[PDB]
Amino acid sequence: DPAPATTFAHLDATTVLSRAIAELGIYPAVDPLDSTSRIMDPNIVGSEHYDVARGVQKILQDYKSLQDIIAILGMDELSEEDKLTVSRARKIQRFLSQPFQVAEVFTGHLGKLVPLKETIKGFQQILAGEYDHLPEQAFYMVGPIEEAVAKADKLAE
């Protein structure tokens, strides 16, 4: 649509919220694959952030790729590292779900603010596979990754 189409030029950061993500109830409901800032770059934001993000961006992306097959066609016609990424992407997915403190009316949850490190680290860890044996709901509606672990434990009963 031309309007949004135009808009981008005038932007510096776009938050495109994904109807799908939203639809997954995930709140953050983002279309993270177009919630962006041009000002993403190791140069600017330090590479760690950047890279991790790129690893993520990627991870989702690859994952994205599969989806079309899997959609009718499930797994095992895929390798399990693909599964790993998928899962990770999924954990991550859930991890982006980060509750809403404001809208306890909507959520009941209290929402989180994640100071950056828990984020950078957070993903580095999941990526590190450090989370890759936890229940995915652990990341679901959490902010700081530790809490996801905490949440994991209890979700692990």
63 CB-near residues (< 8 Å, 6+ apart): 85, 86, 89
Instruction: With contacts defined by CB under 8 A, name the span among 11-19, 72-80, 124-132, 147-155 that binds another protein.
Output: 72-80
Given candidates 77, 84, 103, 128, which one binds another protein under the rule CB under 8 A? 77
| CA-based radius of gyration for the chain | 16
CB 127 → another protein: shortest distance, Å?
26
Say if residues 35 and 16 touch (Cβ distance below 8 Å): yes
Instruction: With contacts defined by CB under 8 A, name the span among 8-16, 65-73, 84-92, 105-113 that binds another protein.
Output: 65-73
CA distance 63 to 43: 27
CB 20 → another protein: shortest distance, Å?
13
Nearest alpha-carbon partner for 129 in 96, 90, 85: 85
Nearer to another protein, 12 or 77 (CB): 77
CB 34 → another protein: shortest distance, Å?
18
Site string for another protein, 5-44 (x = CB under 8 A): ----------------------------------------
Instruction: Note whether 74 binds another protein by CB under 8 A.
Output: yes
> For residue 85, with 0-12 CB atoms within 10 Å meaning exposed, 13-18 middle and 19 or more buried, which class applies?
buried
End-to-end CA distance of the chain: 48
Binding site for another protein (CB under 8 A): 71-74, 76-77
